[PDB]
Subunit: 130 residues, 4 copies
Amino acid sequence: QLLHTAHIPVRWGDMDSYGHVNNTLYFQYLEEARVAWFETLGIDLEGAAEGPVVLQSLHTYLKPVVHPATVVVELYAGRLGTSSLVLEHRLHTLEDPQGTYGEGHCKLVWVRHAENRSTPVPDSIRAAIA
Amino acid sequence: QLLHTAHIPVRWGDMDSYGHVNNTLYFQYLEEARVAWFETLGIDLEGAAEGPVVLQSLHTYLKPVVHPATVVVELYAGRLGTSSLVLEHRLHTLEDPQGTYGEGHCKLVWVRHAENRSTPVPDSIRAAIA
Amino acid sequence: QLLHTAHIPVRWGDMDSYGHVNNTLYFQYLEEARVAWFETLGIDLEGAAEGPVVLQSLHTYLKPVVHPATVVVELYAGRLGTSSLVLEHRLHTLEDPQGTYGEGHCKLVWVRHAENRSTPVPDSIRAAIA
Amino acid sequence: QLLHTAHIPVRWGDMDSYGHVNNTLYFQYLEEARVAWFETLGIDLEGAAEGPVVLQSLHTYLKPVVHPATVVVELYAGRLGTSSLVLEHRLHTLEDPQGTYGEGHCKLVWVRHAENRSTPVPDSIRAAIA
Ligand SMILES: [Cl-]
Ligand SMILES: [Cl-]
Ligand SMILES: [Cl-]
Ligand SMILES: [Cl-]
């Protein structure tokens, strides 16, 4: 199930000395896409007592991106636990909407932060998925 | 004279622990705007033997930007020398198009890179300004 | 087998609005550690016709880092193929040398870049591992 | 008067497609140096009700830095007002301690943040300077 599609313009300063987007920056793109998805659901990250924490990131690099470009990040529902969710991702560009530039996943766990303890996934996400 | 207006979306990761865009990032926004202006003029930065080099950056911070936001960078023609140009800038947001969030300038000098020597400003810029 | 230990100071600007190092930045730390390992082996990344390309990154986030801190990145030899190597990593801090802050791996493939084709791993790495 | 000397290792990912440190990153180096100076004075930036805010940054780029390198940031006392201080800077490298790679200043104003109003510079800084 597709949860969210984000369009993330590439900045010239995102490139490294290889002259393509630096490999680190793809994780910022993925972060931006999740933040936008969270925003659509009123999860604002703005110092809430409970919210999603990244446990694990996996990314496979398949094709480089070169400025100027707009990266398209598709987020898909992976497995939902009581307090965790796997968000699967695929990355394309606007000019190359069917090329897969990279893919992977982000495992999120919902935690009450001041307490360091897992808490249930919000109703909105259960509703979206389930 | 207004040379270029760029729209630069703010990324959540652009913020620092103060919860506003980190002061360093405004220079990336200014860089992106100049790169876009250069692109409109076919100055591609893509390893040309000659091109613009930043000599000096000045920026005055007036109002913070908080995600989500789109920064609007206006570039104005400052003083043009035989091989240098002052690009004056003003920064607003899309939601606050008349608030000045920051302002300053970037002095550019055209140089042949392998030689470290100043060269004339391209005709396109002289034409645009003059 | 431990291949390399890098010490990577944390910069204040590495933190995000959560007030810990931004999750993206751990990949820069891992990149810096690999670049330093490569440097010890005279793999300079400086535009060589052949060299290592990141195929995949996996990282598990276990404990946050807060500025000021020095991240310690340990790189271990994972599985070696004819033209690929898995570099396994563990992350600690100088003050907490036995806490595991994160762990994962980076799969590298050696490729001739202008040709997009896999090439053998350098003798130095085979020698180090084997 | 020299207030502080910081040593800031350059990271490979600090470089852009020109193959030198990206011009934006010098401002991060300057930020790191000020944060370290502030730390020596027990100004911790960690959510204090009052503290220094950057009003203006000026930097002149004189020589590029190429990885690997350690940037040396020297901070000097410029003019002290009742609630502002100009911190003048000069940038060198460890290998080139007398080459000036860049120079400029950062104007800081002390402000109570929740109120947006200038407040006196801390005794420690007046003592250091005066
Ligand atoms: Cl595109
Ligand atoms: Cl906006
Ligand atoms: Cl530490
Ligand atoms: Cl050095």
